[PDB]
Structure formats: structure tokens, C-alpha cells
């Protein structure tokens, strides 16, 4: 049960100046309103999981 609860991914901010591709690409990104859909788990950012397509550059150790 503890291992299962731990795989439920946490929320990780998309803002990143440490990876130079995001440091450039995010300067041209447009922040659009995220309209609340009635939930508390809206993944409006990236997820804190090594296998996420936007978090694979992060070293989870």
C-alpha cells in the first residue's frame, strides 16, 4: 500500500532555467488560463516521475 501510494505522481513545476532548452523555449511560451474542472489533481504542470516525457532530464536518486 505504501509503495502504491508512492507511485501516484506529484506535481512538478514546468518552469525550469537549469535545462537550456527550456530556458529558451519557455521565453516564447504563452501562459493560458487553466479553468478549474472541479478536481484537486489537474496536471497543469509536469509530474515528478522519472518516466514523464517532460521530467526525464531530472535525476531522481
Amino acid at each position: 500500500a505504501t509503495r502504491w501510494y508512492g507511485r501516484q505522481p506529484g506535481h512538478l513545476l514546468r518552469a525550469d532555467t537549469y535545462w537550456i532548452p527550456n530556458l529558451v523555449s519557455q521565453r516564447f511560451a504563452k501562459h493560458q488560463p487553466a479553468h478549474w474542472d472541479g478536481t484537486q489533481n489537474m496536471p497543469i504542470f509536469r509530474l515528478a516521475d522519472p518516466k514523464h516525457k517532460d521530467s526525464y532530464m531530472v535525476q531522481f536518486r
Binding site: 501510494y5 508512492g6 506529484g10 515528478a48
Partner: peptide
């Protein structure tokens, strides 16, 4: 703690 502790 596990990284998803702020949600559970």
C-alpha cells in the same frame, strides 16, 4: 518522504 506527499 515520498515526493507525492503534498497530495496524499
Amino acid at each position: 518522504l515520498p515526493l507525492n506527499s503534498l497530495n496524499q
